[PDB]
């Protein structure tokens, strides 16, 4: 329509409708001023963001140690890179979507209009598909960023894609074309889920207290982000060998008997029989008996003599095989040289040695959680318990410099090593030394057979488990700790001195301790955190800076006179030193209010001077002009940083806060004025419906997207390989055209 | 207020055997290792084993292997000390000692007042 | 099967400082012998006072100090009291067992 209704501030250019020129003049003037007001409304943001970083970040006092007598201090700001702080950042970025929202409905006499829901909408569409893009672009080459936390993208992608989906099904599903006192206080009431899940993520789901720390310089004067990172010649008959080795747990041993000499077309019968040494048949060894028979054009024959595995500790053992009684079948052949095979066995059941890597360790105080291994060594046998614990020495650790912990790691068999967890408090310090200590105790063997445990002449209490090793039933001991049925337990419980030094060499084998028992680790300060505090201090009264700053190469010439009108107007914003911030937020977020008032009056006056919808121009022009600062906070999230959780992450809160307070708010204080009068708050679902189920659509398309380019061939999210990285951009660009044009069409009933 | 206490003053005959007390009191006893020690006038001091009540764990030297057998009952926190086939050698002071199961830290923290065991007939 | 050697006994005066040697009969004390220092005041009581040659008990007072000079440990009495008169041993940790030293009387005139 060509009639324009009036504005909450401008007013009616008359006469309405004037002629043809007139309407390219008075919409040439609505065009170049809405777009100064984006340029205000993009400065004042930024600035409003910077106050929030502000806000919400903590403010260290750090002394710089010099060889020197004087020592430097300076203030500086650590800014956590948390959930629950992107999504309060996000929500600085969304203002003015959300103020555009609530004035003009509140200023419009409680009347739903097409611009509000509109232009949140085309911020949706141009969040999640030009922003996105951008961030995929911007990311150099050959550099990938990847969503760590999987997750939490989906919980939050599927909110935010809710979000628009309930936007439908309150306008057409439930009582259509009517919006309820109901249905937009919990639109508004979604936001607070939203918080509390933020906090929880922060607490439970992402363990950011515990998470590898960097550190990187900010936007502001002393501002320092901190960030989640990764972690740093008759025949004779004869032995091959003569003296043959094995392992207890090879099962059988193989001994190569070779008939050489002679003549080779013959048959040769040979016995051959197993005799005790230092080990015993039946316990140690397989007896076995033969006779091994040497065909015509056979020289050598394998035999194999079963080696019985156990639990036991022992020394080196051997046993005998001897050949004998060469006979010829129809002098010939003879007992040759070496004639007798000494079998030793190697046993492998030693409990372990158990010790640290090195006596001393150097951690940062950014590490976390840090790993010590314990290793085991010369050994592997039966579950052992090893107790640790922690000991405080100059790190004055209880939550201060580290947590206490204490318990202990149980060995399983043949596992050789184990690690233990120490959270390690991150206080942001220059220059830090502090010492504590590791120790391990007196290690246990917890877990045995039976004739072990006869052995060692255990005297505790055992329960019989499941577990079967070496062809025994395997059991473990009771603990005081543990009360069990205490009819499952079983008490396992003069020698012939044969049977005592068995005892002895059993108890040889238990687990003892190493080299290292004692670690000394020393906490010291983040090489990433000092090199930003020295970048910091190499470029770095306040109200007459920003009024210097705000007047002072071409390319520069033309933005800084572009854009000195709205920075010597917002120079009289208060300083972010003031009331921790909160002097820079009250009026900022005025002033936004400010130019959010005019442009909502600049985007009507300017569709109804040339024709066009309130829903078209929305889309197009009010929804790209109010995302400028969700597009440079998701670029610079995504360059600086090391994944892509928080670019993503930017553009999901913006497009969840978008609904939740942007439409929340504005339809619920509609609607309750309603219901004040007892009458209805009516809304046209046929513009909005289209556009949000459009979004549906192409974001289920953008998030496919995303979820494939996490293969190896690309890596990840955001940057890869450079033709895979143009064909994501173009496709997603394409998707915002197409949604725009296709939304375009539909406004004028072409459906 | 950690305390052990042990038992009398105790005579054997040659060739018997005896049971020795040592009740833990003022710290979680099937958590701690005890210590026996035996001590002779003139011959330093000697260390028997120890043991863990937790789970019965034992060490001891290769002199007192067989001599000497170390038992628990936790129901009461006491630690038990058995020696078998008494000789003159025997007749001795017996010590219990509180260890946390550490190196680091001392193996000898609170001893009892000692039970003398004399053997002779 | 090792044998620790100490002096037979210690005199010294109060408020001086007093050095007792712990020598073991295989070589030289290394941190892996964790020396322990115990004392025996008369009518058999017994307190342990250094462990791990030098992790010092609590409650102990802090003129007790356990050190490794040279090949042997060393328990340093700094400003020694008369009340420190007494008897005092050194285990020595071997691969499997305690080996306690022969005591050194140590006495303080009054």
């Known amino acids: 329509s060509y009639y324009c209704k009036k504005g909450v501030i401008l007013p009616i250019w008359e006469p309405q409708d004037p002629s043809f020129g007139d309407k390219i003049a008075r919409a040439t003037v609505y065009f170049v001023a809405m777009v100064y007001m984006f340029l205000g409304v993009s400065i004042i943001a930024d600035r409003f963001m910077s106050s929030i970083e502000v806000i919400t970040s903590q403010e260290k006092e750090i002394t710089i140690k010099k060889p020197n007598g004087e020592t430097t201090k300076t203030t500086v700001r650590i800014w956590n890179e948390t959930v629950s702080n992107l999504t309060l950042m996000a929500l600085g970025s969304s203002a003015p979507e959300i103020l555009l929202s609530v004035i003009e409905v509140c200023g419009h006499n409680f009347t739903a209009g097409d611009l509000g829901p509109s232009t949140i909408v085309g911020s949706a569409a141009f969040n999640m598909f030009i922003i996105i893009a951008l961030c995929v672009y911007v990311v150099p080459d050959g550099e990938t960023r990847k969503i760590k936390h999987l997750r939490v993208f989906f919980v939050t992608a599927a909110w935010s894609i809710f979000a628009y989906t309930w936007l439908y099904i309150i306008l057409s599903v439930i009582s259509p074309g009517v919006v309820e006192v109901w249905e937009g206080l919990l639109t508004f009431f979604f936001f607070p889920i939203c918080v509390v899940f933020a906090w929880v993520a922060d607490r439970r789901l992402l363990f950011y207290k515990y998470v590898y720390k960097r550190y990187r310089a900010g936007k502001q004067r002393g501002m320092i982000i901190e960030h989640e990172g990764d972690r740093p010649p008759v025949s004779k008959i004869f032995f091959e060998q003569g003296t043959y080795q094995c392992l207890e747990n090879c099962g059988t041993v193989a001994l190569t008997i070779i008939r050489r000499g002679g003549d080779l077309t013959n048959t040769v019968f040979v016995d051959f029989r197993t005799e005790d040494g230092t080990a015993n048949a039946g316990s140690d060894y397989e007896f076995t008996e033969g006779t091994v028979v040497f065909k015509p054009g056979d020289t050598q024959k394998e035999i194999r003599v079963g080696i019985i595995d156990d639990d036991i500790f022992e020394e080196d053992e051997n046993f005998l095989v001897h050949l004998s009684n060469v006979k010829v079948s129809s002098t010939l052949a003879c007992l040759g040289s070496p004639s007798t095979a000494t079998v030793t066995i190697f046993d492998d059941d030693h409990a372990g040695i158990f010790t640290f890597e090195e006596p001393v360790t150097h951690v940062s105080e950014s590490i976390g959680i840090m790993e010590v291994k314990v290793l085991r060594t010369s050994g592997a046998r039966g579950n052992v318990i090893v107790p640790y614990k922690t000991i405080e020495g100059t790190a004055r650790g209880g939550g201060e410099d580290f947590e206490d912990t204490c318990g202990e790691l149980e060995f399983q068999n043949d596992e050789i090593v184990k690690t233990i967890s120490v959270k390690v408090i991150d206080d942001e310090e220059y220059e830090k030394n502090k010492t504590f200590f590791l120790e391990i105790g007196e290690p246990r063997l917890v877990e045995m057979s039976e004739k072990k445990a006869l052995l060692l002449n255990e005297l505790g209490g055992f329960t019989i488990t499941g577990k079967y090793l070496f062809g025994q039933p395997v059991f473990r001991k009771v603990h005081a700790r543990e009360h069990p049925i205490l009819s499952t337990v079983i008490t396992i419980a003069p020698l012939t001195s044969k049977e005592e030094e068995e005892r002895r060499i059993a108890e040889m084998g238990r687990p003892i301790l190493g080299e290292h028992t004692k670690l000394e680790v020393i906490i010291e300060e983040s090489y990433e955190f000092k090199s930003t505090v020295d970048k910091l201090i190499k470029k770095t009264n306040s109200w007459r800076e920003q009024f210097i700053e705000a007047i002072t190469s071409c390319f520069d010439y033309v933005m800084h006179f572009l854009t000195v009108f709205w920075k010597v107007l917002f120079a009289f914003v208060p300083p972010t030193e003031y009331w921790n911030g909160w002097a820079c937020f009250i009026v900022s977020i005025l002033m936004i209010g400010l130019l959010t008032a005019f442009i909502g009056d600049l985007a009507s006056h300017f569709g109804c001077t040339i024709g066009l919808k309130d829903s078209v121009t929305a889309v197009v022009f009010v929804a790209l002009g109010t995302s400028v600062p969700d597009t440079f906070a998701s670029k610079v999230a995504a360059t600086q940083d090391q994944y892509a959780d928080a670019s993503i992450g930017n553009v999901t809160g913006s497009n969840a806060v978008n609904v939740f307070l942007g439409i929340g708010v504005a339809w619920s204080i509609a609607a309750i004025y309603h219901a004040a009068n007892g009458e209805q708050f009516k809304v046209s679902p046929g513009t909005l419906a289209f556009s949000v189920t459009l979004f549906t659509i192409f974001a289920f398309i953008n998030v496919g997207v995303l979820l494939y380019r996490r293969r190896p061939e690309i890596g990840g999210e955001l940057g890869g390989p450079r033709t895979a990285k143009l064909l994501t951009s173009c496709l997603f660009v394409l998707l915002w055209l197409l949604y725009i044009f296709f939304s375009s069409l539909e406004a004028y009933c072409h459906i | 207020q950690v305390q052990l206490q042990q038992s009398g003053a105790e005579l054997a005959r040659p060739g018997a055997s005896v049971k020795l007390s040592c009740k833990a009191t003022?710290?979680?006893?099937?958590?701690?290792?005890m210590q026996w020690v035996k001590q002779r006038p003139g011959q330093g001091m000697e260390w028997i084993g120890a043991?863990?009540?937790?789970?019965?764990?034992?060490r001891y030297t290769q002199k007192f292997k067989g001599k000497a057998t170390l038992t628990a009952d936790k129901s009461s926190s006491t630690a038990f000390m058995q020696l078998r086939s008494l000789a003159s050698e025997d007749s001795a002071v017996y010590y219990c000692?509180?260890?946390?199961?550490?190196?680091?830290?001392?193996?000898?923290?609170?001893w009892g007042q000692g039970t003398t065991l004399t053997v002779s007939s | 099967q090792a044998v620790v050697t100490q002096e037979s006994a210690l005199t010294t005066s109060p408020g001086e400082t007093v050095t007792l040697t712990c020598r073991s009969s295989?070589?030289?004390?290394?941190?892996?012998?964790?020396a322990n220092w115990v004392q025996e005041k008369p009518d058999h009581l017994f307190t342990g006072l250094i462990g791990?040659?030098?992790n010092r008990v609590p409650g102990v007072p802090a003129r007790f100090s356990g050190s490794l000079i040279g090949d042997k440990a060393a328990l340093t009495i700094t400003g020694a009291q008369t009340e420190d008169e007494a008897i005092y041993f050194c285990?020595?940790?071997?691969?499997?067992?305690?080996?306690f030293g022969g005591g050194t009387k140590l006495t303080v005139l009054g």
């Open positions: 000692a509180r260890w946390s199961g550490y190196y680091g830290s001392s193996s000898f923290d609170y």
């Open positions: 003022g710290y979680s006893f099937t958590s701690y290792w």
């Open positions: 043991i863990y009540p937790g789970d019965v764990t034992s």
């Open positions: 295989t070589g030289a004390v290394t941190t892996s012998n964790y």
């Open positions: 791990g040659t030098n």
């Open positions: 285990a020595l940790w071997y691969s499997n067992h305690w080996v």
